[PDB]
From Swiss-Prot, chains A, B:
Forms homo- or heterooligomeric complexes. Binds specific components of the JNK signaling pathway namely, MAPK8/JNK1, MAPK9/JNK2, MAPK10/JNK3, MAP2K7/MKK7, MAP3K11/MLK3 and DLK1. Also binds the proline-rich domain-containing splice variant of apolipoprotein E receptor 2 (ApoER2). Interacts, via the PID domain, with ARHGEF28. Binds the cytoplasmic tails of LRP1 and LRP2 (Megalin). Binds the TPR motif-containing C-terminal of KNS2, then the pre-assembled MAPK8IP1 scaffolding complexes are transported as a cargo of kinesin, to the required subcellular location. Belongs to the JIP scaffold family. This is C-Jun-amino-terminal kinase-interacting protein 1. It is linked to Type 2 diabetes mellitus: A multifactorial disorder of glucose homeostasis caused by a lack of sensitivity to insulin. Affected individuals usually have an obese body habitus and manifestations of a metabolic syndrome characterized by diabetes, insulin resistance, hypertension and hypertriglyceridemia. The disease results in long-term complications that affect the eyes, kidneys, nerves, and blood vessels. The JNK-interacting protein (JIP) group of scaffold proteins selectively mediates JNK signaling by aggregating specific components of the MAPK cascade to form a functional JNK signaling module. Required for JNK activation in response to excitotoxic stress. Cytoplasmic MAPK8IP1 causes inhibition of JNK-regulated activity by retaining JNK in the cytoplasm and inhibiting JNK phosphorylation of c-Jun. May also participate in ApoER2-specific reelin signaling. Directly, or indirectly, regulates GLUT2 gene expression and beta-cell function. The destruction boxes (D-box) may act as recognition signals for degradation via the ubiquitin-proteasome pathway. A chemically synthesized cell-permeable peptide of the minimal inhibitory domain decreases brain lesions in both transient and permanent ischemia. The level of protection is still high when administered 6 or 12 hours after ischemia. Phosphorylated by MAPK8, MAPK9 and MAPK10. Phosphorylated by isoform 1 and isoform 2 of VRK2. Hyperphosphorylated during mitosis following activation of stress-activated and MAP kinases. It is found in: Cytoplasm; Cytoplasm, Perinuclear region; Nucleus; Endoplasmic reticulum membrane. Residues 1-59 form the SH3 domain.
Length: 59, 59
């Protein structure tokens, strides 16, 4: 189920990054490593990393 | 003359990235490209890109 939500537009520049649109639903299985999250984007079905401060926890 | 200030810690994972600490003063000369800024970090003297929402504009 959805763990996080994207809060800022993120356009990948690098080959391991996950594209985000504001309010995109995210599934984060693991703890952040060195201020990056690894996520499955539930709108786009893509997987990848994004910066720690671009998503919040959902309740 | 400083144009922006970092408000969140940004730990590079990629070779072209700029390391930010909270409060670093930044010189942004160029237009953002796909919501990344290119900057000179006035604390460290380092250059590179970081995601646009990690900094505020200073007047």
């Amino acid at each position: 189920e959805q763990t996080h939500r994207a809060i800022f537009r993120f356009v990948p520049r690098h080959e391991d990054e996950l594209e985000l649109e504001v309010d995109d639903p995210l599934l984060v299985e693991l703890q952040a490593e060195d201020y990056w999250y690894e996520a499955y984007n539930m709108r786009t079905g893509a997987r990848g990393v994004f910066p720690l401060y671009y998503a919040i926890e959902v309740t």
